[PDB]
Design a binder for these strands. Structure first.
Lengths: 55, 55, 55, 55
RNA sequence: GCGUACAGGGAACACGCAACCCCGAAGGAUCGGGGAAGGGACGUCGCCAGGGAGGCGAUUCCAUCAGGAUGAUGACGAGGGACUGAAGAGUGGGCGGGGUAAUACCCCGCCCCUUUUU
């Protein structure tokens, strides 16, 4: 429900040092790196969490 | 600490109530947003966390 | 003498290593660029080249 | 940030180095000719970076 | 997003119109301003109806591997010193050769133009 249209990098910052940042882009592919801390669970919403649900 | 290379249309939700994905690309600009609930506070840069730091 | 080469964009001449690439397109001309220093002097199509050949 | 754009009919640079010309145009692909001093180290991004990593 | 054609001193913007936001005003008359950034929009871009609807196409390098690392691998051609090269397709303009009572039309070779293979 949101849209912000960043340019270089602006954090996420819900209060747990999770920060979105655009690193690189060419063509139609965006290097988007997130320096979230290690205690939170990061994942790709794909076949990974699909087989996590289908464990 | 940075995991990246998500193509247009793909999603990268970390496994919680985040729902982060790319919303298209206008060349050198990015379209990015979430449908995270308003209980957690997602914001842009220091231009919108200086209100969070009261400065 | 007149060495020729090929690009789809993002050219390179070693030795300079800072600004060798203006290789974009919008139909007729060059478009892409990020940064360039003042230590690499430039001259357009005889523009200021004539005045530096004069005085 | 000192990004230029000139005519694709012909091109030149400052006088201490004899420099690039322009020959072809095909979409994003482009033929580049340079009237360069052969002796000066000139290379593209193919193998020379790897052999400099070797050296 | 649509565009436009630049201007030179070194500038991802140069301008217009859309797009966006906010304000005011007279209740057959719908008018005018201001800006360039905000937020909790399950988005942007196109269409279909009875006795006051519910619907349909929709992400565009088919790359290809994954993982706590300002990740990687690639993308027709490597040396280069060349108005480079190798191909493929098509357009017509042509030049010839064969077919063709003849004309018209069919096939083959070469030059130029557009497009495809980082």
């Amino acid at each position: 429900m949101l849209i912000l249209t960043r340019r270089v990098g602006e954090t996420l910052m819900v209060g747990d040092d999770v920060t979105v940042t655009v690193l690189g882009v060419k063509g139609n592919q965006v290097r988007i790196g997130v320096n979230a801390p290690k205690e939170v669970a990061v994942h790709r919403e794909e076949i990974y969490q699909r087989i996590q649900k289908e464990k």
